[PDB]
Write a structure and sequence with these properties.
Two copies of one chain form a homodimer. By secondary structure, chain A is α/β, with parallel strands linked by helices. The first copy, chain A, contains four helices and nine strands. The structure holds inosinic acid (2 copies). Chain A: Its main location: cytoplasm.
Chain lengths: 184, 187
């Protein structure tokens, strides 16, 4: 599809759907010998709002396909604004994130929950800007790698806009300037 | 169709839901053709009522994009209080922005007894939004405890305990692709 504010398309929703199916395939095998079951010992997807909402709805669906018992958790940051509802102490957790850049965020999340003692703590990210860490972090599961660029859609946003896009696209440079200043 | 041993009968498949959401999304598109909805300035604000609307929402918002409907996505989390019969729930997460002078759309998984949905509505009505409406995937008309009509309805249903595509039984089965009826031999 083509857009007005996109400098170029990155990941079409078809390619995306494909990369997700695949990763959930890897996830599925990796916890095979883990005695995961509904109710008692399911895979706890701790998803981070609001940028992984799309990723999480599609990926959790990728996992039912591989018959993977899962628990949905939603937490928010901006600061901790919404924490987990139920405990992850003695559970396998999957911190679902949208994109790792500086990693300053996921590192914080990881340890916090790491000090929460789950049976194991792993991370899936939809998009990963490997070339920009301000600090070391390695996602366990990665759908796609992207260069240091501002991308929107598939849940991803600029000022809480362009999230509902079906595709991952690049925000035209002369569009964020064009608004960032109208802002700041 | 897929198998669901824990399910006695599938109600709706992903594709049926798809067809119904898309349909609903165009209807939302004509109804707002004239309110000059625009990004940043005056989008369609989607108030997703966690945890159940998460799947509906991800899908809903895309169909709407297809119809060029600029949507602002908001997510709210709530918790029962008991203590309550008015529909009173505790706010764990509120919207990032105000809805004042805004075209707002509450997004529920299922309207049933409607106490919560009716309660949030009243909550948000008092925040002076440009307009306030609701879309619900599922609706169990009879089951009211309070009079409540939704502005959009993906599909109607009888009083079954349903599950899937967001909807849960004791935090279970929401990850499912289709909406199915939890079989009696499981409660
Ligand atoms: O290109 C981007 N598009 C959308 N959000 C981004 C982008 N880069 C960073 N972010 C947001 O920045 C948050 C923190 O990134 P990090 O802490 O540097 O890994 C992410 O969860 C994203 O929501
Ligand atoms: O048929 C159902 N299956 C699963 N959960 C349901 C069903 N009906 C209501 N719920 C849950 O209970 C909430 C209450 O809806 P209410 O009865 O209209 O207030 C819903 O949002 C769901 O989380």
């Amino acid at each position: 599809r083509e857009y007005e504010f996109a400098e170029k398309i990155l990941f079409t929703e078809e390619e995306i759907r494909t990369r997700i199916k695949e990763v959930a395939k890897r996830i599925a095998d990796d916890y095979k010998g883990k005695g995961l079951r509904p109710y008692v010992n399911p895979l706890v997807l701790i998803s981070v709002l609001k940028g992984s909402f799309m990723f999480t709805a599609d990926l959790c669906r990728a996992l039912c396909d591989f018959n993977v018992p899962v628990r949905m958790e939603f937490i928010c940051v901006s600061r901790m604004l919404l924490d987990t509802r139920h405990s992850i102490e003695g559970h396998h957790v999957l911190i679902v994130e949208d994109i790792v850049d500086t990693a300053l965020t996921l590192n914080y999340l990881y340890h916090m929950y790491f000090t929460r003692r789950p049976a194991s703590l792993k991370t899936v990210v939809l998009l990963d800007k490997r070339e920009g860490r301000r600090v070391p972090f390695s996602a366990d599961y990665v759908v796609a790698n992207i260069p240091n660029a501002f991308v929107i859609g598939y849940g991803l946003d600029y000022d809480d806009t362009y999230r509902e896009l079906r595709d991952i696209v690049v925000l035209r440079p002369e569009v964020y300037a064009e608004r960032e200043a109208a802002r700041q």
